[PDB]
Amino acid sequence: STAGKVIKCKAAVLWEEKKPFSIEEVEVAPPKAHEVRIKMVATGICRSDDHVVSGTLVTPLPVIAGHEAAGIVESIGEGVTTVRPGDKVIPLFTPQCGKCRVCKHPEGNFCLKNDLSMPRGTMQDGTSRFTCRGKPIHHFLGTSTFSQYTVVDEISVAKIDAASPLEKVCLIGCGFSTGYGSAVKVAKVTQGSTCAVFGLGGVGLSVIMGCKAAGAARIIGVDINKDKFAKAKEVGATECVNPQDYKKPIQEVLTEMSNGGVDFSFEVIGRLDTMVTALSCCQEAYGVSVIVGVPPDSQNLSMNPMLLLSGRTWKGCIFGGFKSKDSVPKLVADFMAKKFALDPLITHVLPFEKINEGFDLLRSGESIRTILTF
Amino acid sequence: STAGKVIKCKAAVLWEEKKPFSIEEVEVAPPKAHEVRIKMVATGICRSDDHVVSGTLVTPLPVIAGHEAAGIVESIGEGVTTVRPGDKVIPLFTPQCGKCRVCKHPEGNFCLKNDLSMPRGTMQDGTSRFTCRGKPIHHFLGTSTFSQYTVVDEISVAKIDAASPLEKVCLIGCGFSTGYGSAVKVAKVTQGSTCAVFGLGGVGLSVIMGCKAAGAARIIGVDINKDKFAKAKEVGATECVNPQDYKKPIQEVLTEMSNGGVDFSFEVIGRLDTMVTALSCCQEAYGVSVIVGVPPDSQNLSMNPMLLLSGRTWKGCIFGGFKSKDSVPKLVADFMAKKFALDPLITHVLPFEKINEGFDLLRSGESIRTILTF
Ligand SMILES: NC(=O)c1ccc[n+]([C@@H]2O[C@H](COP(=O)([O-])OP(=O)([O-])OC[C@H]3O[C@@H](n4cnc5c(N)[nH+]cnc54)[C@H](O)[C@@H]3O)[C@@H](O)[C@H]2O)c1
Ligand SMILES: NC(=O)c1ccc[n+]([C@@H]2O[C@H](COP(=O)([O-])OP(=O)([O-])OC[C@H]3O[C@@H](n4cnc5c(N)[nH+]cnc54)[C@H](O)[C@@H]3O)[C@@H](O)[C@H]2O)c1
Ligand SMILES: OCc1c(F)c(F)c(F)c(F)c1F
Ligand SMILES: OCc1c(F)c(F)c(F)c(F)c1F
Ligand SMILES: [Zn+2]
Ligand SMILES: [Zn+2]
Ligand SMILES: [Zn+2]
Ligand SMILES: [Zn+2]
């Protein structure tokens, strides 16, 4: 048995910013109390993982990144009650401790045990389970899914349906749930409304899915890469616009197209300028804009607060506003009942060993989601 | 009779910025089609009127300001159906045309016929009803209440209870309704919640009234003028804090006081810094912050969008989110039914001829609302 023992396995270690991942052997300690060690089956490449590489997102290095994944429990530490060895699970990059003021709140999901706001790159106990070349390696968001085995705190894992296809449902661990929830839960898109979605990657496509599910009459996709438009229309966009085609700023174009502003807009890119543009293009009196994209570290946007005084609502969210541990199993169940589709987001499949090629595909603009198989 | 004739009367004309009002004779044309001429009875001094004087707000000059008032209809133009001569009325600085997309929207109140966004300083027809010393004088927000008589568009006036005390209910024309609605309608303050209110003038006090009416457990008033604290506690503040008393930024103080951030915060001053502070002090995952204050013309704030990404909601409003013509008569009816109090807001009552003294009282920090009586 491997239970109670250090596992040697391959992981994708990021030693330095702006460098390829190094696929090499790591040592994965056994789980301590209220920890779970997971044999990974599939992990998606989310733009936020790339942000770690580019320095857009600052987290301590060296690191094992990865946060969108699914696997099978190898072993559980003392006191674990919510998963067992052999269970299929999705790591939760937003934990759900169930005890903090946010977890107890009907609408909050950004559990105070998160490692996002001020990343330490550790387990909840402030230590690491990973060694590489004899050196400690940081965790990422308590998940570190770019490894054949990871160890996560119990509050950062959800048991999912035993019959789930892990190579699909890993997307519920970040990109699908985030985009879909941003529309259906956070914005609360209404039937007959007009939506504008900035950024047509995996997350933006999932926003469109949610807007369509909510009954939006018009869903305007916005991207500077027109190659993204065909898939956006397939999943529900009624029109697509490329800001580069227009002389005027796209907020003006979108205001004109929507006869005075859209009902709901979404920033699904990660740029300060598009966050302000997305706000501006919603109707000034009753529009709602949701920020989903991750901004470059420590940078402030500039905006005129008259955009809000007139009546706009501006909000953001992590993980689509979903309470993670409650929601992930339900989302999987709904997927299994064909309530939504994940295949439109999956454009490439690669073995884990080809992780760098998977990032190249994202960076070139060619992929939506590449799923890596272990 | 005056009907159908030019009225010569007294008004407070602002000829240029940063100068006293000139109290002198103006000529007031009779109302054209769909216009209403009102004999003013009482008008309040709102900080937004002072913003015109100070240049914080830009609107065409020379101007007859004033927007918080009540009076009695002197005459109506052809086609007016909603008021008649002799009716008590409140001018509506936010109109309610009933036809535009905002008026038709269940939540929106910032009617597209407003003269706030891009002020012209005219009637709806692009002309003025005021002359002074042979010169045309601009209107202000379609109301211009600093005059013994004004002319307003029908969409900018509401009929109110004939038994209403006009020297109190004029506050429903701006400051009471704005603050109360910002809490009860826009923020939707919840029972048992913790609120922070920045600025304890007439509008901030009305926010406190609304937070208390909504059942907030804690209502923390914030002002740099500690003389404002006693009245804030009278109307429901459970604690008051002066940022000047602390070595740390007040957002940190308020986060600590509320064991991790407030449920609802309100900016009721008009400063960019306090807008960002008020946002920051609400709980990062589920907090709501509402901007009520009017900041200086054309200035942008700077903020880190991570404040929103974690889950905060940021909104603003004009006139407390109330659809003006529907809401004003109901608010007056509620006042007459003793559902809320207005006396706590009224610190001074002066003749109209003392308008400048009234503004000096506001600027010195001594008054909440001065009511000017004609
Ligand atoms: N809030 C959350 O919980 C959460 C979850 C997942 C992803 N994210 C972030 O969401 C963003 C999108 O992630 P993704 O879908 O994986 O990324 P992606 O696949 O890189 O998609 C981004 C899209 O934005 C497009 N784009 C780039 N610049 C512009 C521009 N100026 N105007 C219009 N379109 C432009 C780009 O062409 C691409 O199709 C990233 O910033 C992620 O870090 C946030
Ligand atoms: N959104 C609307 O529809 C609407 C309606 C009415 C008023 N307003 C605006 O709301 C604001 C308040 O109006 P009001 O109540 O008549 O004004 P006011 O009576 O001057 O009250 C403002 C209060 O803010 C206090 N203050 C000033 N600087 C600070 C600071 N740094 N920190 C904390 N407190 C501070 C000040 O001492 C005073 O008590 C003004 O900007 C108005 O223009 C907006
Ligand atoms: O893609 C999800 C995601 C986020 F939304 C973040 F805000 C973040 F910091 C991060 F590391 C992450 F992975
Ligand atoms: O006090 C109400 C009020 C406002 F909220 C404004 F935004 C404004 F421009 C103005 F002139 C005004 F009077
Ligand atoms: Zn929690
Ligand atoms: Zn992600
Ligand atoms: Zn209207
Ligand atoms: Zn006012």
CA dist B175 and B93 (Å) reads 12
Give the ligand 1 atom nearest the CA of A51: 43
Per CB distance under 8 Å, which residues of A are interface residues toward B? Answer: 101-102, 105, 107-110, 112, 117, 259-260, 272, 275, 283-286, 291-292, 294-295, 298-306, 308-318, 321
Q: Tell which of B270, B290, B317 closes a domain.
A: B317
A110 and A126 co-located in one domain: yes
Q: Where would I find the beta strands (DSSP E) of A165-307?
A: 194-198, 218-222, 239-241, 264-267, 288-291, 301-303
CA dist A204 and A222 (Å) reads 9
A149 and A241 co-located in one domain: no
CA dist A159 and A152 (Å) reads 13
Cα A262 to the center of its chain, rounded Å: 25
How many residues are recorded in chain B? 374
3-state secondary structure of B108: coil
Q: Tell which of B287, B317, B347 closes a domain.
A: B317
Which chain B residues are closer than 8 Å to A271 by Cβ?
Answer: none
Say if the Cβ atoms of B260 and A309 lie within 8 Å: no
| DSSP H/E element including B290 | strand B288-291
Q: Where would I find the beta strands (DSSP E) of B128-274?
A: 130-132, 135-137, 149-153, 157-159, 194-198, 218-222, 239-241, 264-267
Exposure of A12 in the CB half-sphere (CA atoms within 13 A) = 29
The CATH number covering residue B331 comes to 3.90.180.10
Q: Tell which of B317, B333, B366 closes a domain.
A: B317
Tokens of A156: 């950062």
Of residues A292, A319, A326, A329, the one with CA closest to residue A114: A319
Strand-pair partners of A373: A42, A351
The position carrying tokens 């010195």 is B364
A275 and A326 co-located in one domain: no
Residues 6 or more apart whose CB falls under 8 angstroms from that of A42 comprise: A69, A70, A71, A166, A167, A170, A371, A372, A373, A374
Ligand 2 atom 2, closest CA? B318
Say whether B311 counts as a known binding-site residue.
no
Tokens of B219: 């209502």
The position carrying tokens 């306090």 is B274
Of residues B75, B82, B63, the one with CA closest to residue B30: B75
B184 and B242 co-located in one domain: yes
Sign, Cα dihedral of A42, A48, A50, A52: negative
Say whether B46 counts as a known binding-site residue.
yes
Q: Which ligand is nearest to the CA of B318?
A: 2
B265 catalytic? Reply is no
A310 and A337 co-located in one domain: no
Secondary structure of chain B: what % helix, strand, coil (to 5)?
A: 30, 25, 45
B114 and B198 co-located in one domain: no
A139 and A211 co-located in one domain: no
What's the gap in Å between B322 CA and the centre of ligand 8?
A: 14
CA dist A278 and A268 (Å) reads 10
Q: What are phi and psi of B371, to 5 degrees?
A: -100, 125
Q: Which letter does DSSP use for residue B183 in this model?
A: I
Experimental structure resolution, Å = 1.2
A144 and A244 co-located in one domain: no
Structure solved via: X-ray
Q: Which of B310, B317, B323 to mutate to test the interface with A (most CBs of A within 10 A)?
A: B310
CA dist A44 and A178 (Å) reads 14
CA dist A302 and A172 (Å) reads 33
The position carrying tokens 């001074």 is B348
Cβ contact B198:B274 at 8 Å: yes
Say if the Cβ atoms of A312 and B308 lie within 8 Å: no
Tokens of B365: 């920090």
A48 catalytic? Reply is yes
Q: CA-CA distances (angstroms) from residue B118 to B67, B141, B297, B325?
A: 17, 10, 12, 21
A169 and A193 co-located in one domain: no
Angle at B72 between CA B68 and CA B74, to 5 degrees: 125
CA dist B227 and A116 (Å) reads 42
Say if the Cβ atoms of A300 and B300 lie within 8 Å: no
Residues 6 or more apart whose CB falls under 8 angstroms from that of B172 comprise: B70, B90, B328, B331, B332, B335, B342
Give the ligand 2 atom nearest the CA of B200: 39
A34 and A171 co-located in one domain: yes
Q: Which ligand is nearest to the CA of A104?
A: 5
CA dist B228 and B240 (Å) reads 9
Say if the Cβ atoms of B109 and A309 lie within 8 Å: no
Cβ contact B296:B56 at 8 Å: yes
B222 and B147 co-located in one domain: no
CA dist A22 and A14 (Å) reads 6
CA dist B218 and B263 (Å) reads 10
CA dist A102 and A110 (Å) reads 7
Q: Count how many domains chain A has.
A: 2
The CATH number covering residue A246 comes to 3.40.50.720
A31: exposed, middle or buried (Cβ count in 10 Å: 0-12, 13-18, 19+): buried
Name the residue range of residue B133's domain: 1-178+318-374
B171 and B190 co-located in one domain: no
**DSSP assignment of B226-241, as one string?**
GGGHHHHHHTT-SEEE
Q: CA-CA distances (angstroms) from residue B101 to A196, A283, A287, B10, B178?
A: 18, 10, 12, 38, 22
For chain A, counts of helices (H) and of strands (E): 11, 19
CA dist A303 and A309 (Å) reads 12
Among B101, B303, B310, the residue with its CB nearest the CB of A301 is B303
Cβ contact B341:B210 at 8 Å: no
B174 catalytic? Reply is yes
A270's torsion region: left (phi>0), alpha (psi -120 to 50) or beta?
Answer: left
